[PDB]
Amino acid sequence: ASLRYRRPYWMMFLKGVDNWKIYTVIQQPDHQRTEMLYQAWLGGLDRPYTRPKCMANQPLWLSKKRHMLRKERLDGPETPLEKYVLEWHKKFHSFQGTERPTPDDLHTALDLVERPLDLSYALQLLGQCRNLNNIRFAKETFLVFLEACLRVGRRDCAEYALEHAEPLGFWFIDEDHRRYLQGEQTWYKLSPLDNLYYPVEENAKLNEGR
Amino acid sequence: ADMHLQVVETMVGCGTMKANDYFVRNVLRQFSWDSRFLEALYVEYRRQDDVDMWAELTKRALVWTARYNAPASERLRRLIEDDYDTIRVQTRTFRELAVFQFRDVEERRHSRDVVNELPNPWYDYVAHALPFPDRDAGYPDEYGDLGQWRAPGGPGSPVRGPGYYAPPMEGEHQRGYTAEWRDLRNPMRPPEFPTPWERKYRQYARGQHPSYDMVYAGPMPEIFPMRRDFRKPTRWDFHDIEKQGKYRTSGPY
Amino acid sequence: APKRVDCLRIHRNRPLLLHPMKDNNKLLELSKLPARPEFDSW
C-alpha cells in the first residue's frame, strides 16, 4: 500500500496536494503550457515561470512573495484597534513566521476596545492566542478583558467568560470580580490613584467623599 | 576489565560491602565488563541484611546486564536460581522454560521406552557426501551411436568422438580414440580401471555373467500384430524417463 | 453509479493478437493527418 514504485521518487511522503498525477505528466508540452498559464493566473510574477521539475507545492520564495503581496481583507481601518489588528496580522501571520504572541501584546490589543466591532476583533485575537498560538494568559488578563467588555457595555460576554474561564485560559479571577459578574456586588474595582470605586454608576453611591 | 575484575573479586572476598560501589563507579559505565563481575557481586549481594535489599540489588544487576550488553552467564543465572525459594526472582525466559519442559519430558519418555531404542539409518548418519559416486557404474560412454551426428557433444556431453568412423587424428587423440577412451558397449570387458587398480580385477573383467544357463522368465514377444510404440502414461513407474524414447530392438528373441 | 483484442490464426492454428498501437508513436498522427493537403480539407 505504498506509492514508492507507482510515482516518481521525489514524491515520498507526499500528502495534501490536490492531485499528484498532474506533476507526473507536467513535463509534456501541453501540460507545461497549462501550468505556466496557471502560474500567470495566480499572478505575482513578471516573466513566464514554471514549477521546478521535482516539486509539487509552490516554491518557498514564490509562496512567501504571494503571501506578502496579497491585499488585506480589511481596508481603511477606521479605528486604532483595526490598525493594530492589521499590524498584528502583518507581524505574526506572516508566511512561515516563528515569533509568538505575548500577554503584553494581548493587553495592548485589548486596551484599544472602543466599539462592539473592536470588541469582537479583540476576542478573535484572544481566542487565536489561546488556541492557535497556545499562550498562557497573564494574571491581569481577566481584568483587562472585563474592562474591555465594560467599555462597550457587554456584561453577558463577561459573565459567560466567568462561567467557564478555565477553557478560555483565565486561570485566575479576582473574588470581587466574580461577585460583580455573579451579581453579589455592584462595584467591580477600585482606582487607588483616585480613591474611587468602579463602575461610576455606584461610585457616587458608595464613595460619596474624596 | 580483568584488572578491575581482580579488584572486585578481592573486595568481595574481603567482604568490604563496597565492591558494588567500586563496580558501579569504575567498571559499569566505561568498560565492556562480562558476567563474571555479577557472578561475584552476587556473593556480596547475598550478605545484605534484608532480603528486599538483596532482591533489589539482584534485579538492578540484571537490568545492568540488559542495558550494557553483558548477557548473564549460565553460572550467574544458576546462582540466582539456587535462591529462588527465598527471592522468587526468575532467570529463565518463558520461551526457554516452555521449550525445556517439553524437551525434557520427551527425552525421559524416549529413554524409558525400549521399542524406539533401535537405530534409524535415515536419521543416524549421512551415507555419501562427495560430489561424485564412489564406484564406476559404467557411464560415461565417450562414443556416439547410430544416427548421432553430433560427436563430440561439447558442453555438458561426455561424448568425445563419433561412434564408428572419424576423420584422421594425430598422436594422443588417435591413441585415445582407438584404444584408451571408455567404451560402454564393449561386451568382453568394461572400461578398465587406472593402474594399479586393474590387475586385481583381471578375472572379473571377462564377459558379463558366468551362468549361460539362464531361463527367461519374462513375457513373450508379440509377433503379431507387432506393435511399434508403447507410450503408456503411467502413475507409479519411476523408470518412465528411461522407458520413453526411441530404442533399437535387436536381441535373441 | 477488458477490451477484446482481435485474433488471427496464422500458422499451425497459432493465434496472433494485434494489440492497439502505443499512443506516443508518430504513426497514429501520421494516419490522422490528411493525405493530400492541396485537395482535402485541413
Binding site: 500500500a1 505504498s2 506509492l3 507507482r6 492531485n19 499528484w20 498525477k21 498532474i22 505528466v25 497549462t34 501550468e35 498559464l37 496557471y38 493566473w41 491585499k71 481583507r73 480589511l74 481596508d75 481603511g76 466599539r115 462592539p116 466591532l117 469582537s120 462597550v152 457595555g153 | - | -
Partner: protein
C-alpha cells in the same frame, strides 16, 4: 461471512443445524449445490473452529468497496487518483479569479449596527 466474493450468510438455510453443519463434507456441499468459493470458506471456518479458532475476524467488504473506486490495477489498497482533462481553474472557463468587493465586505454587520443603535 467476511468476504464479498464468498458470502456464507446467503446459505444459512441450507444447513439444518449445528451438527449438520459440522458433519457436512465438501462432497456433501457440492451435492447440496453451494458454489466453490463459498463452500471452501465454510469448510475453512468449520476447520478453524474445530482446531480452536472461532470465526472472529474483520469484515473487509466496506474497505474493499472503498478501495475499488480508486482503480488500482492490482488491488493493492493504495490511492490512485484519476487525472481530469481540465483541472486548472483558468482552462475551465474562468478568465480570472473573482475580485472581492472590499467596499461591500467592509460594511459593519447587522449585529454591530443594532448594538450601536442601542448604545
Amino acid at each position: 461471512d467476511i468476504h464479498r466474493l464468498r458470502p456464507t450468510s446467503d446459505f444459512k438455510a441450507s444447513f439444518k443445524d449445528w451438527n449438520d453443519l459440522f458433519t457436512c463434507d465438501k462432497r456433501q456441499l457440492r451435492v447440496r449445490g453451494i458454489p466453490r468459493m463459498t463452500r471452501d470458506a465454510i469448510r475453512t471456518a468449520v476447520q478453524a473452529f474445530q482446531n480452536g479458532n472461532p470465526p472472529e475476524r474483520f469484515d473487509t467488504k466496506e474497505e474493499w468497496l472503498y478501495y475499488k473506486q480508486f482503480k488500482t490495477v492490482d488491488y493493492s489498497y493504495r490511492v490512485i487518483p484519476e487525472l481530469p482533462e481540465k483541472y486548472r481553474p483558468h482552462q475551465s472557463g474562468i478568465d480570472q479569479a473573482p475580485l472581492p468587493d472590499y467596499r461591500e465586505i467592509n460594511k459593519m454587520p447587522q449585529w454591530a449596527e443594532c448594538e450601536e443603535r442601542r448604545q
